[PDB]
Amino acid sequence: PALKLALEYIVPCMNKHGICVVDDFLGKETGQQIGDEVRALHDTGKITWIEGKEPGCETIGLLMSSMDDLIRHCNGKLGSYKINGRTKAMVACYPGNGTGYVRHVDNPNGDGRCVTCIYYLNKDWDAKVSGGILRIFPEGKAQFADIEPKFDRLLFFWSDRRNPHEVQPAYATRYAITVWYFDADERARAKVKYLTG
Template sequence: MPFIEPLSDSDLERLALERFVPALHSHGFYYADGFLGELAGGAVLEQVTDMHRAGALQDGRLAGSVPSIHRRSIRGDKTAWVTGGERGCEAVGFLLNLIDKLVSACARGLQSKTIRERSMAMVACYPGNGTGYVKHVDNPNGDGRCITCIYYLNKDWTLADGGILRIFPEGKAYVADIQPLFDRLLLFWSDRRNPHQVQPSYSSRYAITVWYFDSAERAEAKRRHMIAKQQGSSSS
């Protein structure tokens, strides 16, 4: 669904309620093209590539160690975490503000979810050396993450560049292959409904990801963490 001009608040609400919410209910994911437009999207890309050139991106972390398996065989990206308020991240901050408005509008149509907070933004680059990210689930254990949002920044991307995000929707007889095209915004459920993988990338592949939290699940996850921490302290 391409847009020519920057999206207004009414555009965002209409996009959320007429496109994203129905698709999340029926398919578990949806993407829109032309989210920021050429000028603003280009400014975000410039800031992200500046971060990369400055060495601000570090090897992506794994949630847990896997004996005898090298990290790069699981995920090969380099990442940095930003709020959007940092110097040199003004365009990223503008993007995050629009995504916040979009997801806030989506939340009004997702009555089973109360979404009031999100993660910091993860700026990521797959450096084009054939690395990807193996099939995984963002939130397999109820940590509160509800919606994954990914904004792609790759101009003139072709199938030969690889880097497709492949989603394996739970209970569906198909997979969804999503190219990481410039100015494309993708939303999908973060839980076990959407296992996904990043296929090997053969050109530098840039994206910005944020996760939005379901308030009730997030509070319960924090409660479990505190109990586990207290039990660990009492047993030591």
């Protein structure tokens, strides 16, 4: 029921808060398969872009298609964005070496990315021992939000200056897939801007 989810939760949740969490996105079996697909690429070789239709990246493609389907079902009711495209999936490994990520904005200079979309692959993850908590600071709010990189969790937020985020140090290696959805007008203007100067 993606139509229920998008329209009843994601959209109003995003328009009010700029951040939306969807736990238990694909289920245990589906998630661990995506987890296993990532672990395979890490070890063998076969921060890298995955198109979605490679050998050993099928369930990654399902995730992406699922991700996409939810975006479709929002019916262009996320802000006033015309999402007509996205990046490839960034499959990254995040070491457990007690280093955290400095507070940043994902899209600071209007390159076209309007929505950050992140899926976490950390089974039985316990931030109380392992760390790696995401702190987001909604630009014009009295509160900030700590968010665990929990298994089978899907996280949406505005990529722009509204959501600066840092990640606390972790003491165990982490896996997450990230996708950025483009606004049509914004992405168009950035392309011409680059070429025109």
